[PDB]
């Protein structure tokens, strides 16, 4: 199936408490694999998945140098934005960037992207054509103009189409045992009483990978998706994921409800009752 390489970058200023905190977290699909945190003792780029042990020391040295350079750039960005927005030097502000690429099963580029946010709102983003930027406000328009005059989109395009794709291919090759695996969900249903003669049926799905999954509750063979509560699919601390979805039903009618689980590791969806 398709795979992706994504980096989540954050710079957060802390007036009166030193330089901004800078962090970089990289992912191949739903698996964290690298990280840089300026807040550590002697910050360096570090492996977050076992297969990254296959990279030599030069990988870590070069990525650490890049991260430090990146850290300085965003520190400068934070200062620059204070000016664009006419803000005080004593408030904390945040810059976020999502950057990466996606390839198909054959390893060819499907799409590249890079989007910036300032204080949690859209700032600037590369368009799908990988040739132009879209600015969310007038401040971002200053950046768009600088970037256009500096040939920044051309530079980024080269990274997305080249470096990003090639490294993603390498990571999928080196970490195939982890990244190309499928861990099948194991389900179970819990029951909890409620006032007014009702009960909560909660369908759980645990130990699965990848993260993509579908949980539905049905009655009369029709999905109840609407009056059901749930949590977003979440990491379980060991590279796998879990999720639950619930529905409130009348006491004594529980047997009429079935939970359905659809996942890449379930040749036939799971059907469960309480």
């Amino acid at each position: 199936g398709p795979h992706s390489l994504r980096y989540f970058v954050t710079a957060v200023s802390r007036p009166g408490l030193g330089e901004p905190r800078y962090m970089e977290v990289g992912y191949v699909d739903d698996t964290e694999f690298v990280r840089f945190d300026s807040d550590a003792e002697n910050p360096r780029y570090e492996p977050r998945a076992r297969w990254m042990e296959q990279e030599g020391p030069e990988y870590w040295e070069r990525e650490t140098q890049k991260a430090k350079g990146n850290e300085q750039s965003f520190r400068v960005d934070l200062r620059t934005l204070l000016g664009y927005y006419n803000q005080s030097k004593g408030g904390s502000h945040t810059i976020q960037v999502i950057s990466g690429c996606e390839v198909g099963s054959d390893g060819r580029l499907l799409r590249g992207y890079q989007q910036y946010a300032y204080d949690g709102c859209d700032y600037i983003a590369l368009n799908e054509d990988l040739k132009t930027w879209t600015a969310a406000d007038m401040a971002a328009l200053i950046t768009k103009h600088k970037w256009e005059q500096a040939g920044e989109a051309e530079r980024l395009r080269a990274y997305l189409e080249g470096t990003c794709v090639e490294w993603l291919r390498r990571y999928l090759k080196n970490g195939n045992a982890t990244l190309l695996r499928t861990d099948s969900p194991k389900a179970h249903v819990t029951h909890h009483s409620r006032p007014e003669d009702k009960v909560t049926l909660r369908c759980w799905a645990l130990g699965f990978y990848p993260a993509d999954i579908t949980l539905t509750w049905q009655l009369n063979g029709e999905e109840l998706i609407q009056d059901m509560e749930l949590v977003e699919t979440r990491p379980a601390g060991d590279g796998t994921f879990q999720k639950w979805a619930s529905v409130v039903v009348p006491l004594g009618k529980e047997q009429y409800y079935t939970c359905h689980v659809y996942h890449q590791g379930l040749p036939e969806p799971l059907t469960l009752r309480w």
């Binding site: 990289g26 991260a67 990146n70 750039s73 950057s99 890079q114 910036y116």
Partner: peptide, 8 residues
């Protein structure tokens, strides 16, 4: 590998 960011 990560991208080398410049500035806004």
């Amino acid at each position: 590998e990560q991208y080398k960011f410049y500035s806004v």
